[PDB]
Design a protein around this ligand. Structure first.
Ligand SMILES: [Mg+2]
Ligand SMILES: [Mg+2]
Ligand SMILES: [Mg+2]
Ligand SMILES: [Mg+2]
Ligand SMILES: [Mg+2]
Ligand SMILES: [Mg+2]
Ligand SMILES: [Mg+2]
Ligand SMILES: [Mg+2]
Ligand SMILES: [Mg+2]
Ligand SMILES: [Mg+2]
Ligand SMILES: [Mg+2]
Ligand SMILES: [Mg+2]
Ligand SMILES: [Mg+2]
Ligand SMILES: [Mg+2]
Ligand SMILES: [Mg+2]
Ligand SMILES: [Mg+2]
Ligand SMILES: [Mg+2]
Ligand SMILES: [Mg+2]
Ligand SMILES: [Mg+2]
Ligand SMILES: [Mg+2]
Ligand SMILES: [Mg+2]
Ligand SMILES: [Mg+2]
Ligand SMILES: [Mg+2]
Ligand SMILES: [Mg+2]
Ligand SMILES: [Mg+2]
Ligand SMILES: [Mg+2]
Ligand SMILES: [Mg+2]
Ligand SMILES: [Mg+2]
Ligand SMILES: [Mg+2]
Ligand SMILES: [Mg+2]
Ligand SMILES: [Mg+2]
Ligand SMILES: [Mg+2]
Ligand SMILES: [Mg+2]
Ligand SMILES: [Mg+2]
Ligand SMILES: [Mg+2]
Ligand SMILES: [Mg+2]
Ligand SMILES: [Mg+2]
Ligand SMILES: [Mg+2]
Lengths: 52, 124, 52, 147, 124, 52, 210
RNA sequence: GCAGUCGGCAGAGCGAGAAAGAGAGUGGCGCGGACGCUACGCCGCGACGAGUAGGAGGGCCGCUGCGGUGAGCCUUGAAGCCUAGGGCGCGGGC
RNA sequence: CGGCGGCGAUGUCGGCUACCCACCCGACCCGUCUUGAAACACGGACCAAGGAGUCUAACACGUGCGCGAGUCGGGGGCUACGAAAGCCGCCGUGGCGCAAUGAAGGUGAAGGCCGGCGGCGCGCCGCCGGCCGAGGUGGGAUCCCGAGGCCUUCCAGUCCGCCGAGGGCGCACCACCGGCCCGUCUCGCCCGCCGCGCCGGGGAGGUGGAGCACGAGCGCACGUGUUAGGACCCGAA
RNA sequence: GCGGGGGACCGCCCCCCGGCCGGCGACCGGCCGCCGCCGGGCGCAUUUCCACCGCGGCGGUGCGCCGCGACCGGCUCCGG
RNA sequence: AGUUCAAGAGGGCGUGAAACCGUUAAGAGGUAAACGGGUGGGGUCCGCGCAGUCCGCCCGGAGGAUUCAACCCGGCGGCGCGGUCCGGCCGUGCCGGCGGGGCGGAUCUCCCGCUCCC
RNA sequence: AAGACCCACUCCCCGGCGCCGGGGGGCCCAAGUCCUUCUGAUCGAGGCCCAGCCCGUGGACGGUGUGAGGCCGGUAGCGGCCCCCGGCGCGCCGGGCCCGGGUCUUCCCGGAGUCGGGUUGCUUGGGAAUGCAGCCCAAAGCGGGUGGUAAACU
């Protein structure tokens, strides 16, 4: 925690270095998708096979 | 740029969304409260926005906040801002062509004589 | 020739980035087992033994 | 990586991407910048206007440190000092204006591009632009010449 | 998370076999031995495994526990089932369905119990 | 992420000591296998003795 | 032949450059050998500092660098004279000497004199015969507390006279910096020709009476 | 198109010519239910398919050597080579 | 198909392919230069092994990664693999970027409103104060508001979700119009003082510029293209 | 007067607390409840579980090889 | 005949390809051979083919098994904050301070050294 | 540099000599040929309990009838021993050297067929001549050289 730092504190044993930043913070895509907020905004799924 | 684009009338309490980098601008004296979603925010821009009382979101948080992007202002950086576009256009050496040429160095003996002065033959 | 560019300089921020990412991955049990280390009985994966 | 190069997909094709009619010969057109006034003249005039000819005075022994004058604009003028320097000057009421020596930070001349924030300042430089000094006077402030 | 670990190991795991236009995962709790996100037995918080018992009779079922995810010593709970075939499938189906424990692996585990039990019944 | 658990520090005989170190934040860094492989493919060329 | 829009390049590869190519495969070997020579020197001059003698404060010339101070070759003879150090004992007690350097100003002279008097205050001088101390040699306490110094001896730093926030006066608010620069350039450009014109029109107008 | 495998915490819909809600409140026994989803995956419709020079993509095509990996193979027989044997792949090849 | 038949253990069943043979139709020998090759154009008797777009540098553009108005330690230094990796920040010297223009001397990137005063004859032509303040027009992905409405006996009656006439703010970008900076030209009136000068500054209108007009660069890697190098390989007199 | 030391301020960080709030699904314990599984008892055979048999039915898949028929549907070429 | 695991390694000898040649076997043969498409015939082997498939449920038939359900004990696991059960830990959360510290700052201001001055 | 006036220590080095505490070379230093088994040969395969065969600061490598941490040489180790050659300290004899800083006064001081000029030729980024050389001219001393445009004045 002093070699590379936390996010609140920089690296004590490096000159100017902080921990890299997450481009997304919650990576649980399944937990994101089946959460209620997205599901109320989704349209109805079209699950039916219309073959020739 | 993000300050002035959310500054427009009717864009209050509303989230700035960019699918690129939010970089700092040091010729900015006052930073108002901004709710921002971006791919990357530069470290000083994070400090300025968070010390301004704002929120920085990422896109997975944006999806849980607004699943259809309601209350959003989608923004872009200047897509002609790179220096390649000053070289792009009409060929320099044709009339009324304000295109930067490719020079190894700039100076009085670097691409200034023949096609660029009326005295040295001709001027375009 | 000898003067082929044998050596590659990597940016210092990226070298610390890769050290950060490899350390972060060395604490998730799926990734080290997918590396093939036999850890199915270690008592905790960031396996810290005391300083003796 | 030689394995991502185009030469791996060109194995089995006779002319190696250089044509059967006009081949890959040695130097068809001269070496380097040959014919820049004769047969490459259209390219040289269309893309490099002013390449040929001789303009302006010679200066035989040029010392580039002599004309060294790195400039700064007024929009980055407060970036030379810290943030508490600006906010303490903002909150105090005695009119005690901070000094920005741009020679100290590494610039010799002040040009005036941006808007300058409404509070007094004393700016020291070796040279000033007219628009820079009139903007510092307009915001309230002083321009101090140093050497 | 699990999707991130999957995006790491989906092509660069040691359990990956890519031969003869097929793909298999030799992971210990991978029902169907399939390199998939769903059937991967390492990246999930909740995993089911089914394999033969230590002695040659019976089917042991493996459930991943909720707390010690980073603690592989106490993580998996093993239960040997030495019953008849219908009772063994009833036990596995009740462990998966009544617990609601990762319920899309129900008949992958049921069919694996059936395959191990058939492999344990001797040939003439 | 931001949640940092309490790693148990183990002893000579392998059982868990009473000690606890909170998890360093470098273990919550973005795990970027493309960047790690880029850093690996460029730093591993740096020990190469020349041949000609 | 040139293609479309691109730079005109002049590569200096028209000579037989491949004989005189200097690869750097002995770079970590040179670094490791220079390091061992440095530690061998530091071990040889065992209480004397490893980097070398003390170097004075010099102002760089040639306006790009004249705000910056740095380490010069040696203290000049008038600096040693004002510090009261003989110019031959200076190099024996560890002072760099530059005979060639003039002084043109008092302040750099005095700053390096005070540097010399700050260095002789720190100098722990071992006696020349080890079982018999002499008149000016250091005492046995600082002999036993002598160490080998690393880095430059009292390293040279840029000091900045930081100015507090002042109330701006009306004289500084009325001073016209750009106008004074333009008039300064005009007066410097026109000093000789105006003097010639004044002298000519002064001496030739005496023809009215002579 | 598919994260909707939304299951005794159940109710299994969304091809149907016509903008939108199978919305919610309040006054007037027997313990069951195929497959799927390497999301760089899988599925469905429709149209199309000449090719020199040339360009681009995919190669679970091939050689050598290095870094990881396969608790890999191997003197109960490796590489190589031969083969009227068995095959796979549009093919490179295996 | 919730229809059937026949043949089987030492002579038969199947094996599209795989070896040989038979027959019908098709079928001139490849590579190359060429408008045109099977050519009475050249190279090739046969087989094995070797055998030709590489590397370095520079530049351009595209793409990937990191950081980002900065970026970069490459040179130096400190502490088996390891000649690696880690560190240095008062090692960012320096490079490129953040500013251009002029031959150069040089100069160097918004302004308007209000209070006070035919000097002239800034009603016009400067400075004292305060305030507001970085342009506009058209198009413009997205987004915002909502006249009304999306049934289950029927009137209400609320909340949520959805749709929506119309009206908005308008990203990037394009086109146009203004604006600002340097060169140069034309016209014309002023303003300054330590030295009032062959001084210094300003305005209006055009016009030349590789500019500004709220950044986008740097480093690394990959790919193509153009070069300088033996430069895809072999070849002179 | 210089340079340096001391102090204050400001910002950030770390640690004690006092209080809300969030998470424990990258990160838990204790008891209580409901469930499921494992083991050991009691239960004792119109239950359960094994293995065989019928040319058994039901539903799926295929017949060893060589064949034929039937109707359904699609595209066609004709004819009355 | 002998050595050797092996002369199927015999002193230019490990492996021993192709071109080319000898012999054996089989097939063929007047439009030089060779090839593409389509069959047919004969061989070489292969399928260790040659009375041909099991799987799930139910019915019947005899057989075997100390065997099912339900209740008791113990262990393990999963899951309303059990509205507001008890306690911890963590926060890219915040507020409070009779708080106790590090770092930084171009934010301000008692002692020492040093330089002129009697 | 010398004189006068003050201030201030008697220790540097040579030639010999004896005494005290890095370099070459030589010789060495852990532990399986344990029990079965494959084989032409094993260094392969299995096993070695309650010390999970033994050593491991040694699991580099090579050799030995495939494949070896433990068979051998080696490897590791601030591991050992014996010579040799230094370097480094103290001590003795002889010899040398019998030495300075400050203040004031009085004296003194410089490299020529060289610089420099012209011309020629070569060279350089050096452009009315950067350097060199030949030839011709040919110095001065408050002088000379340089101060990247030839020349005069300052
Ligand atoms: Mg082609
Ligand atoms: Mg050709
Ligand atoms: Mg090509
Ligand atoms: Mg051509
Ligand atoms: Mg042609
Ligand atoms: Mg070429
Ligand atoms: Mg011509
Ligand atoms: Mg071309
Ligand atoms: Mg040194
Ligand atoms: Mg085609
Ligand atoms: Mg024919
Ligand atoms: Mg040809
Ligand atoms: Mg012809
Ligand atoms: Mg032909
Ligand atoms: Mg003919
Ligand atoms: Mg020919
Ligand atoms: Mg021939
Ligand atoms: Mg070959
Ligand atoms: Mg790029
Ligand atoms: Mg090495
Ligand atoms: Mg190009
Ligand atoms: Mg060649
Ligand atoms: Mg080339
Ligand atoms: Mg030749
Ligand atoms: Mg043999
Ligand atoms: Mg042999
Ligand atoms: Mg042989
Ligand atoms: Mg015959
Ligand atoms: Mg063994
Ligand atoms: Mg060995
Ligand atoms: Mg061996
Ligand atoms: Mg062993
Ligand atoms: Mg041994
Ligand atoms: Mg040994
Ligand atoms: Mg040794
Ligand atoms: Mg020359
Ligand atoms: Mg002069
Ligand atoms: Mg001159």
């Amino acid at each position: 925690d002093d070699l590379y730092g936390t996010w609140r504190k920089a690296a004590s044993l490096k000159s100017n270095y902080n921990l890299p930043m997450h481009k997304m913070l919650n990576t649980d895509l399944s937990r994101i998708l089946k959460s209620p907020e997205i599901q109320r905004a989704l349209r109805a799924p079209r699950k039916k096979i219309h073959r020739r | 740029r993000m300050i002035r684009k959310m500054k427009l009338p009717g864009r209050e309490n509303k989230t700035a969304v960019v699918v690129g980098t939010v970089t700092d601008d040091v010729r900015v004296q006052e930073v108002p409260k901004l709710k921002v979603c971006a791919l990357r925010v530069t470290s000083r821009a994070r400090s300025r926005i968070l010390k301004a009382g704002g929120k920085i979101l990422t896109f997975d948080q944006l999806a849980l906040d607004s699943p259809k992007g309601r209350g959003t202002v989608l923004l872009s950086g200047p897509r002609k801002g790179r220096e390649v576009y000053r070289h792009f256009g009409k060929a320099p050496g044709t009339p009324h062509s304000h295109t930067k040429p490719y020079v190894r160095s700039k100076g009085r003996k670097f691409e200034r004589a023949r096609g660029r002065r009326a005295s040295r033959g001709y001027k375009n | 020739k000898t003067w082929r560019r044998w050596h590659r300089r990597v940016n210092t921020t990226q070298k610390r980035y890769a050290i950060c990412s490899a350390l972060a991955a060395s604490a998730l049990p799926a990734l080290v087992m997918s590396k093939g280390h036999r850890i199915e009985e270690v008592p905790e994966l960031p396996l810290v033994v005391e300083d003796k | 990586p030689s394995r991502l190069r185009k030469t791996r997909k060109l194995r089995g094709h006779v002319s190696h991407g250089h044509g059967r009619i006009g081949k890959h010969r040695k130097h068809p057109g001269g070496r380097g910048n040959a014919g820049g006034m004769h047969h490459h003249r259209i390219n040289f005039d269309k893309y490099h206007p002013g390449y040929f000819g001789k303009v302006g005075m010679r200066h035989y022994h040029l010392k580039r440190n002599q004309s060294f004058c790195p400039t700064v604009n007024l929009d980055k003028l407060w970036t030379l000092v810290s943030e508490q320097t600006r906010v303490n000057a903002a909150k105090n009421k005695t009119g005690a204006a901070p000094i920005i020596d741009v020679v100290r930070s590494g610039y010799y001349k002040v040009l005036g591009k941006g808007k300058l924030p409404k509070q007094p300042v004393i700016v020291k430089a070796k040279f000033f632009s007219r628009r820079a000094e009139e903007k510092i006077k307009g915001v309230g402030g002083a321009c101090v010449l140093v050497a | 998370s699990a999707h991130l670990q999957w995006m790491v190991v989906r092509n660069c795991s040691s359990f990956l076999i890519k031969r003869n236009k097929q793909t298999y995962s030799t992971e210990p709790n991978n029902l169907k031995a399939r390199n998939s996100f769903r059937y991967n037995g390492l990246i999930h918080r909740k995993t089911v495994g089914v394999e033969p018992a230590a002695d040659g009779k019976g089917v042991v079922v493996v459930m991943k526990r909720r707390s010690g995810q980073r603690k592989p010593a106490t993580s998996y709970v093993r239960t040997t089932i030495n019953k008849n075939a219908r009772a063994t499938l009833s036990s596995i189906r009740h462990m998966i369905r009544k617990n609601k424990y990762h319920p899309d692996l129900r008949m992958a585990a049921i069919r694996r119990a059936s395959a191990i039990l058939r492999s344990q019944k001797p040939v003439m | 992420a931001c949640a940092r658990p309490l790693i148990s520090v183990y002893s000579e005989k392998g059982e868990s000591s009473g000690k606890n170190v909170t998890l360093p934040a470098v273990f919550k860094a973005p795990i970027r296998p493309d960047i790690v492989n880029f850093v690996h493919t460029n730093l591993r060329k740096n020990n190469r003795q020349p041949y000609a | 032949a040139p293609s479309r829009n691109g730079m005109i390049l002049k590569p200096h590869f028209h000579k037989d450059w491949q004989r005189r190519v200097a690869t750097w495969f002995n770079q970590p070997a040179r670094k490791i050998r220079r390091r061992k020579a440095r530690q061998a020197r530091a071990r040889r001059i065992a209480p004397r500092p490893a980097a070398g003698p003390i170097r004075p404060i010099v102002r760089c010339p040639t306006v790009r660098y004249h705000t910056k101070v740095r380490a010069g070759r040696g203290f000049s003879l008038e600096e040693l004279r004002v510090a009261g150090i003989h110019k031959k004992v200076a190099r024996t007690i560890g002072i760099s000497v530059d005979p060639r350097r003039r002084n043109k100003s008092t302040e750099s002279l005095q700053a390096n004199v005070q540097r010399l008097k700050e260095y002789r205050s720190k100098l722990v001088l071992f006696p020349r015969k080890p079982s018999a101390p002499k008149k000016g040699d250091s005492s046995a306490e600082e002999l036993k507390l002598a160490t080998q110094l690393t880095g430059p001896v009292m390293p040279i730093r840029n000091v900045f006279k930081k100015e507090k926030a002042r109330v701006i006066t009306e004289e500084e608010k009325n001073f016209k910096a750009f106008a004074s620069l333009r008039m300064a350039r005009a007066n410097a450009r026109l000093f000789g020709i105006r003097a010639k014109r004044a002298k000519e029109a002064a001496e030739q107008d005496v023809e009215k009476k002579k």
